[PDB]
Write an enzyme that holds these catalytic residues in place. Structure first.
Site, PDB file in Angstrom:
ATOM      1  N   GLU A 237       7.951  -4.602  -4.063  1.00 40.32           N
ATOM      2  CA  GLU A 237       8.907  -4.001  -3.416  1.00 40.32           C
ATOM      3  C   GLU A 237      10.120  -4.638  -3.829  1.00 40.32           C
ATOM      4  O   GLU A 237      11.285  -3.961  -3.713  1.00 40.32           O
ATOM      5  CB  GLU A 237       8.781  -3.860  -1.819  1.00 40.32           C
ATOM      6  CG  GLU A 237       7.483  -3.409  -1.564  1.00 40.32           C
ATOM      7  CD  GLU A 237       7.394  -1.718  -1.720  1.00 40.32           C
ATOM      8  OE1 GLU A 237       6.534  -1.123  -1.197  1.00 40.32           O
ATOM      9  OE2 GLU A 237       8.484  -1.392  -1.829  1.00 40.32           O
TER      10      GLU A 237
ATOM     11  N   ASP B 190      14.613   4.589  -2.429  1.00 36.90           N
ATOM     12  CA  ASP B 190      13.464   4.284  -2.925  1.00 36.90           C
ATOM     13  C   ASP B 190      12.894   5.005  -4.254  1.00 36.90           C
ATOM     14  O   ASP B 190      13.954   6.081  -4.539  1.00 36.90           O
ATOM     15  CB  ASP B 190      12.310   4.067  -1.946  1.00 36.90           C
ATOM     16  CG  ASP B 190      12.061   5.317  -1.261  1.00 36.90           C
ATOM     17  OD1 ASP B 190      11.135   5.301  -0.424  1.00 36.90           O
ATOM     18  OD2 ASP B 190      12.266   6.339  -1.605  1.00 36.90           O
TER      19      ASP B 190
ATOM     20  N   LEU C 268      11.700   1.176   4.713  1.00 36.87           N
ATOM     21  CA  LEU C 268      11.986   2.466   5.009  1.00 36.87           C
ATOM     22  C   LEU C 268      13.076   2.657   6.098  1.00 36.87           C
ATOM     23  O   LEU C 268      12.544   2.290   7.375  1.00 36.87           O
ATOM     24  CB  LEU C 268      11.013   3.564   5.107  1.00 36.87           C
ATOM     25  CG  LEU C 268      11.359   5.173   5.134  1.00 36.87           C
ATOM     26  CD1 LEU C 268      12.209   5.626   4.218  1.00 36.87           C
ATOM     27  CD2 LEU C 268      10.459   5.809   5.823  1.00 36.87           C
TER      28      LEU C 268
ATOM     29  N   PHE D 281       1.237  -0.018   3.312  1.00 38.29           N
ATOM     30  CA  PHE D 281       2.672  -0.501   3.779  1.00 38.29           C
ATOM     31  C   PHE D 281       3.424   0.709   3.091  1.00 38.29           C
ATOM     32  O   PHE D 281       4.608   1.114   3.326  1.00 38.29           O
ATOM     33  CB  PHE D 281       2.861  -1.768   2.995  1.00 38.29           C
ATOM     34  CG  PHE D 281       4.181  -2.294   3.020  1.00 38.29           C
ATOM     35  CD1 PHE D 281       5.155  -2.119   2.312  1.00 38.29           C
ATOM     36  CD2 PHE D 281       4.508  -3.137   4.148  1.00 38.29           C
ATOM     37  CE1 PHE D 281       6.432  -2.478   2.249  1.00 38.29           C
ATOM     38  CE2 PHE D 281       5.775  -3.725   4.149  1.00 38.29           C
ATOM     39  CZ  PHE D 281       6.761  -3.518   3.270  1.00 38.29           C
TER      40      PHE D 281
ATOM     41  N   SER E 148     -12.238   8.068  -1.924  1.00 40.16           N
ATOM     42  CA  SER E 148     -12.023   6.785  -2.212  1.00 40.16           C
ATOM     43  C   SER E 148     -12.704   5.713  -1.202  1.00 40.16           C
ATOM     44  O   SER E 148     -13.152   4.642  -1.672  1.00 40.16           O
ATOM     45  CB  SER E 148     -10.530   6.518  -2.697  1.00 40.16           C
ATOM     46  OG  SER E 148     -10.033   7.171  -3.734  1.00 40.16           O
TER      47      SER E 148
ATOM     48  N   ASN F 221     -11.698   7.501  -8.850  1.00 41.92           N
ATOM     49  CA  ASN F 221     -10.994   8.498  -7.946  1.00 41.92           C
ATOM     50  C   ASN F 221      -9.510   8.069  -7.399  1.00 41.92           C
ATOM     51  O   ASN F 221      -8.877   9.032  -7.145  1.00 41.92           O
ATOM     52  CB  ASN F 221     -12.144   8.279  -6.816  1.00 41.92           C
ATOM     53  CG  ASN F 221     -11.641   9.557  -5.553  1.00 41.92           C
ATOM     54  OD1 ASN F 221     -11.148   9.335  -4.853  1.00 41.92           O
ATOM     55  ND2 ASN F 221     -12.347  10.762  -6.051  1.00 41.92           N
TER      56      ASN F 221
END
Ligand SMILES: [Cl-]
Ligand SMILES: [Cl-]
Length: 164
Positions: A11, A20, A32, A104, A117, A132
């Site tokens: 990040e 972002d 965010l 996250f 998955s 996948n």
């Protein structure tokens, strides 16, 4: 390596409001603020999050505090989610960091949608899960990070973050 260092690498850290990869107002370590296109709405959300009039900028200490809160929330979210908890309960410590990373980034709901998955991970079919996971908008929009996370699920080691 640990989840904090991992997310910090993925990040980065910015002390002023930024947009972002999806164009949403964000701050600190991928925190965010809002999906709304209004910078004023973002500034409002920021002040509310921090507890003071920030005027769009925060300190490193503030950024780290938001980060601890966000990692904790992601973990708590996984543990309360019926589709995620069983996966988390089934994985080793390194791989769980990869799961936390996804939550996250995309939220609990987003992650819960990787049904196939998730089942492969539960069954410990690493290479199959990896293929996948790659068939996704996530991988096509943020390929470098997705590769790091996927390699982490695949190998159960920190190799993808070593030398970064
Ligand atoms: Cl695809
Ligand atoms: Cl990327």
């Amino acid at each position: 390596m640990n989840i904090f260092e991992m997310l910090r690498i993925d990040e980065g850290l910015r002390l002023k409001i930024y947009k972002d990869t999806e164009g949403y107002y964000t701050i600190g370590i991928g925190h965010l603020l809002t999906k709304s296109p209004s910078l004023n709405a973002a500034k409002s959300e920021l002040d509310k999050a921090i507890g003071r009039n920030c005027n769009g900028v925060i300190t490193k200490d503030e950024a780290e505090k938001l980060f601890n809160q966000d990692v904790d929330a992601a973990v708590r979210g996984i543990l309360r989610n019926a589709k995620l908890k069983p996966v988390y309960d089934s994985l080793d410590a390194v791989r769980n960091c990869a799961l936390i990373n996804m939550v996250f980034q995309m939220g609990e709901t987003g992650v819960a949608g990787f049904t196939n998955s998730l089942r492969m991970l539960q069954q410990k079919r690493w290479d199959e899960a990896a293929v996948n996971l790659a068939k996704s908008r996530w991988y096509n929009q943020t390929p470098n990070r997705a590769k790091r996370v996927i390699t982490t699920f695949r190998t159960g080691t920190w190799d993808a973050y070593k030398n970064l």
